[PDB]
Amino acid sequence: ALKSMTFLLMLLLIFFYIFAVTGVYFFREYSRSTIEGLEYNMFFSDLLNSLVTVFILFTLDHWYAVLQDIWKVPESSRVFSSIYVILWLLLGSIIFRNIIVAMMVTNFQNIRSELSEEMSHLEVQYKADMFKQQIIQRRQ
Amino acid sequence: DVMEKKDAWDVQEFITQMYIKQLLRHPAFQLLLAFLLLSNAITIALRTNSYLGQKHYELFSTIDDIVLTILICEVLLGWLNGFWIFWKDGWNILNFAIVFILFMGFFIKQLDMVAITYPLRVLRLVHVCMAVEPLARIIKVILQSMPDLANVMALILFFMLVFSVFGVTLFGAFVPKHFQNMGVALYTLFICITQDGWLDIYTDFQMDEREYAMEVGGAIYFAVFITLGAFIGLNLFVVVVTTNLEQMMK
Amino acid sequence: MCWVMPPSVFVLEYYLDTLWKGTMLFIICLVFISCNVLREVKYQETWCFPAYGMVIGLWLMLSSIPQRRLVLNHTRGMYHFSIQGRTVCQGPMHLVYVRLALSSDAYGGRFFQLVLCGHKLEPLVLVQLSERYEQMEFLGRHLARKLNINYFDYLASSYRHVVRHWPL
Amino acid sequence: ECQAYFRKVIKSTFFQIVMITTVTTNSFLLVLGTNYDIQFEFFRTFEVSELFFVSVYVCEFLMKVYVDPITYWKDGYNILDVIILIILTIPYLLRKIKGNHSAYLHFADGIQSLRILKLISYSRGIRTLIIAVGETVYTVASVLTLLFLLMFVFAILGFCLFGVTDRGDLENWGNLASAFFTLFSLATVDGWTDLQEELDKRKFTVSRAFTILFILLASFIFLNMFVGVMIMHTEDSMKKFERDLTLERNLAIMEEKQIILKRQQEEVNRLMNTQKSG
Amino acid sequence: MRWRDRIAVLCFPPGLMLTVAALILFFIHMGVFASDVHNFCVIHNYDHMSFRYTVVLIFSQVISIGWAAMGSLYAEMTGDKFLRCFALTILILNGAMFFNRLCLEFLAINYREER
Numbered sequence: 001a002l003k004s005m006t007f008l009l010m011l012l013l014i015f016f017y018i019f020a021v022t023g024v025y026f027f028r029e030y031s032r033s034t035i036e037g038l039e040y041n042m043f044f045s046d047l048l049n050s051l052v053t054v055f056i057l058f059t060l061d062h063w064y065a066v067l068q069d070i071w072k073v074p075e076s077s078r079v080f081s082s083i084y085v086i087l088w089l090l091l092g093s094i095i096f097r098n099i100i101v102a103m104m105v106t107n108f109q110n111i112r113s114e115l116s117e118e119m120s121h122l123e124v125q126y127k128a129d130m131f132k133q134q135i136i137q138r139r140q
Numbered sequence: 141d142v143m144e145k146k147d148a149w150d151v152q153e154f155i156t157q158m159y160i161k162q163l164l165r166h167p168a169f170q171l172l173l174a175f176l177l178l179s180n181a182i183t184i185a186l187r188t189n190s191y192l193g194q195k196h197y198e199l200f201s202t203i204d205d206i207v208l209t210i211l212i213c214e215v216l217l218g219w220l221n222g223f224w225i226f227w228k229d230g231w232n233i234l235n236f237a238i239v240f241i242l243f244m245g246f247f248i249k250q251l252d253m254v255a256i257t258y259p260l261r262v263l264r265l266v267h268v269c270m271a272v273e274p275l276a277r278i279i280k281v282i283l284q285s286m287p288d289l290a291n292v293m294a295l296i297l298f299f300m301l302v303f304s305v306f307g308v309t310l311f312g313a314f315v316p317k318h319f320q321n322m323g324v325a326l327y328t329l330f331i332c333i334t335q336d337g338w339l340d341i342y343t344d345f346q347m348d349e350r351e352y353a354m355e356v357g358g359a360i361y362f363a364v365f366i367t368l369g370a371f372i373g374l375n376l377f378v379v380v381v382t383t384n385l386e387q388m389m390k
Numbered sequence: 391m392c393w394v395m396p397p398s399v400f401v402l403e404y405y406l407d408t409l410w411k412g413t414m415l416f417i418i419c420l421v422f423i424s425c426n427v428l429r430e431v432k433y434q435e436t437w438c439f440p441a442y443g444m445v446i447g448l449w450l451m452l453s454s455i456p457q458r459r460l461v462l463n464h465t466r467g468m469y470h471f472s473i474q475g476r477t478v479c480q481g482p483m484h485l486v487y488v489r490l491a492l493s494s495d496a497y498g499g500r501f502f503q504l505v506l507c508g509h510k511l512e513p514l515v516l517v518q519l520s521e522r523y524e525q526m527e528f529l530g531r532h533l534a535r536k537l538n539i540n541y542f543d544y545l546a547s548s549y550r551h552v553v554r555h556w557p558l
Numbered sequence: 559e560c561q562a563y564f565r566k567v568i569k570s571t572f573f574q575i576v577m578i579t580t581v582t583t584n585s586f587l588l589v590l591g592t593n594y595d596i597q598f599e600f601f602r603t604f605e606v607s608e609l610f611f612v613s614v615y616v617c618e619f620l621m622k623v624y625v626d627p628i629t630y631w632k633d634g635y636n637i638l639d640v641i642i643l644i645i646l647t648i649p650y651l652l653r654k655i656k657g658n659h660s661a662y663l664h665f666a667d668g669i670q671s672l673r674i675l676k677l678i679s680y681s682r683g684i685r686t687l688i689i690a691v692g693e694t695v696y697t698v699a700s701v702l703t704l705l706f707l708l709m710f711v712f713a714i715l716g717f718c719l720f721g722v723t724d725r726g727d728l729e730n731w732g733n734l735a736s737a738f739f740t741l742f743s744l745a746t747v748d749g750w751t752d753l754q755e756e757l758d759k760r761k762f763t764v765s766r767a768f769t770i771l772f773i774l775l776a777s778f779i780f781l782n783m784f785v786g787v788m789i790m791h792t793e794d795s796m797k798k799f800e801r802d803l804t805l806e807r808n809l810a811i812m813e814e815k816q817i818i819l820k821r822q823q824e825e826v827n828r829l830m831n832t833q834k835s836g
Numbered sequence: 837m838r839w840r841d842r843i844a845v846l847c848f849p850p851g852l853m854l855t856v857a858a859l860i861l862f863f864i865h866m867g868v869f870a871s872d873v874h875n876f877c878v879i880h881n882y883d884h885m886s887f888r889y890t891v892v893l894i895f896s897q898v899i900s901i902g903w904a905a906m907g908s909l910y911a912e913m914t915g916d917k918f919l920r921c922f923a924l925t926i927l928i929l930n931g932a933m934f935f936n937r938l939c940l941e942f943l944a945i946n947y948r949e950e951r
């Protein structure tokens with residue numbers, strides 16, 4: 001399986017890279033604001049913090065609460081930012097989870113396929129062996 | 141063969157052929173109906189705001205009357221071909237029930253109000269958008285998957301009950317308000333099986349003796365039950381999905 | 391019932407079911423007459439929809455049909471269109487057929503009926519069983535054993551249909 | 559005239575190497591610009607490199623402005639990359655030298671990420687993967703439309719159940735966007751516990767039953783239906799490609815065996831001819 | 837054939853039922869329309885208007901329109917121009933009738949009741 005992980009892994013990490021670096025300077029006014037009462041401020045502060053928080057969005061834990069904690073930013077009619085992060089989390093999570101489970105069950109499929117063709121070839125060889133045993137017996 | 145002269149039943153069959161050629165095979169009438177439904181869906185989305193409503197309520201009433209009368213006209217046209225065939229159908233029953241409820245709530249006084257008028261309209265929207273091809277195959281197999289899903293639900297709820305008998309032993313009159321009432325306990329265990337944010341419950345039954353108490357035993361029992369049930373349920377769901385779609389590609 | 395009807399010794403006889411339809415209309419409207427809804431607060435009385443029930447039903451009882459028959463007796467009968475009292479249609483062959491007809495909905499479900507084609511004749515609608523083709527031509531073969539005439543299938547001649555008399 | 563030579567030049571690998579080097583230096587520029595010090599200080603290198611990168615992208619659009627749009631207007635990756643080029647060129651044209659009535663700055667790292675997407679537009683292996691997964695676009699669009707229909711149905715239902723009474727529960731089943739976001743959270747697993755604790759206090763006992771019913775329909779149907787559809791769509795798409803590859807290998811083996819047999823027959827015929835003539 | 841026997845018993849010729857029904861509907865509806873314009877114009881006794889029966893006769897109007905159209909469709913294939921002219925004329929007069937009474941009703945709003 002991990003040998004078969006060739007291109008999908010770098011596709012996953014490069015989508016992570018592009019989406020994280022896009023979302024760095026999207027909720028910039030979340031961490032860079034003068035609001036005293038906030039507790040998810042550090043999530044969107046640094047580039048490494050951006051990687052960690054978009055990984056959190058990828059894992060999809062408390063995305064509701066993350067969105068309400070970013071709602072303390074002045075709502076600019078949600079025209080670009082909230083739809084961007086929601087689309088990113090949903091698309092990335094479902095597309096990558098689905099693609100990995102699909103390719104893993106495909107790996108199981110061809111494992112069983114090569115196993116079954118091996119037993120079929122063994123059965124064909126056994127039939128040929130038994131037929132040649134009849135041929136040899138009649139040849140004596 | 142030759143058909144030197146047609147008869148009355150041939151004339152009736154040709155009339156029914158014309159009637160099913162129009163409004164059932166012609167894309168223009170279906171496109172017009174879909175356009176009207178999308179326009180009133182735009183008006184649906186334009187609701188939840190009295191600022192638009194104060195100059196749109198009379199137009200909303202007129203378009204409600206228009207969509208109701210075209211729906212009952214379509215139902216009458218379907219009835220024209222025969223009541224028996226329309227009554228013995230899988231989706232015309234649903235459409236007839238939709239238009240019957242909407243018309244009764246419109247003409248006769250009813251407490252059905254917005255919570256029935258609007259979801260019935262969007263149900264009709266779903267029914268009409270099923271007719272166009274690139275959603276009908278996907279919709280057809282969701283309903284094909286529910287008979288094989290129902291047994292999974294039955295097994296899940298039976299295991300849920302027979303493990304809630306274990307649950308309700310350590311429930312009731314202690315660590316209460318989510319473990320008591322024997323229906324709130326069942327639905328809270330269902331929440332914990334759906335498995336998101338149960339550390340509120342963890343802190344709820346936390347600090348029994350601060351070292352082991354039953355805080356070890358009951359917590360590990362219900363934790364392994366929760367993880368086994370969640371894994372088995374998710375696996376069975378995706379298994380029924382993969383079975384029925386293997387059916388749709390077979 | 392599978393063996394009783396195929397022979398149809400000599401004549402056949404037939405009727406209509408509009409009397410049934412008018413019958414439940416009359417029952418429904420008689421129910422409507424007594425203790426209907428009280429919608430005087432709606433500034434309207436709905437007694438005239440039952441008046442249309444009166445009119446439609448009385449007209450439907452005006453269509454009485456005594457025993458639609460023909461000259462299908464197992465002889466050299468001409469299949470003249472015969473009613474008790476009046477007689478209308480006559481013909482030397484070439485008009486009486488038994489034809490399969492098909493109907494389709496928007497989804498594409500096919501429903502199969504049978505019609506004894508002719509000059510204002512009566513159909514051969516079977517009793518609420520049309521989902522599969524089953525055997526088709528066997529009933530046509532029993533009709534052929536009766537007084538062999540025709541068995542017409544869908545669309546043109548092509549194949550899979552039988553004729554016995556032709557006027558060329 | 560010189561179109562054949564220009565196509566040979568564009569097929570030469572040195573140009574692609576220079577292109578990849580330029581956009582990888584652009585990626586490094588974005589990496590250094592996501593910091594604060596290099597973003598606006600020590601940025602003469604940033605300025606000259608950005609000028610080089612936009613010159614390279616202008617050359618890209620210049621070599622894609624040929625008659626090849628007759629194939630770029632019906633293909634996949636080709637129309638994707640020219641659209642990326644257009645939505646790259648226009649925003650920094652109106653941003654770097656703006657002098658205009660724009661809102662604020664929010665499309666700098668986005669532009670750089672589109673440039674990184676143009677970088678990853680290479681790698682023919684990833685291109686083959688994209689082709690192999692590209693037949694599921696209609697299916698995922700259909701599942702997305704069914705999802706959106708379910709959100710609209712339960713959006714009007716949640717509004718009618720909790721926001722029209724106007725006794726609380728505002729900005730959860732009240733305003734349209736907040737209601738939609740709460741419904742998306744309830745369709746996911748996140749936030750359901752706190753949402754339930756918020757809704758159970760609004761004298762609506764059957765709201766708990768409605769929400770758990772909504773979960774057991776929406777979450778299960780969406781997740782399991784999506785994972786299924788993708789699993790066998792990709793399984794059947796891989797299967798045909800693998801059988802075609804094995805068929806091509808079998809045809810090559812048959813051709814090699816036929817060539818060997820023809821060579822043996824020719825050798826036998828030549829040996830017989832030499833034996834007859836000698 | 838024997839149209840005496842055709843019109844005598846047990847049936848009617850195909851079509852020509854809905855046309856006659858539309859004729860009698862036209863008769864009774866000219867009666868009520870003439871009464872309405874009379875009492876609206878001169879004698880002014882609105883308590884005896886047709887303010888009471890307002891939707892059932894509208895339903896009668898639309899079903900009469902439908903039956904006229906349906907009889908026209910059922911009688912067009914006779915191959916005779918007189919029957920087609922008959923059906924088209926009765927359909928046209930019924931439709932213009934319907935528009936006229938709809939306009940009269942829409943003019944008579946402020947006289948019925950208020951919600």
Ligand SMILES: CC(C)CCC[C@@H](C)[C@H]1CC[C@H]2[C@@H]3CC=C4C[C@@H](O)CC[C@]4(C)[C@H]3CC[C@]12C
Binds near residue numbers: 445889893
């Ligand atoms: C059922 C089909 C054939 C339609 C027949 C409609 C008949 C029954 C209706 C339509 C018009 C109606 C009349 C219209 C006007 C008047 C004058 C009013 O002061 C009392 C009622 C009265 C006298 C109505 C009696 C019933 C009536 C004649």
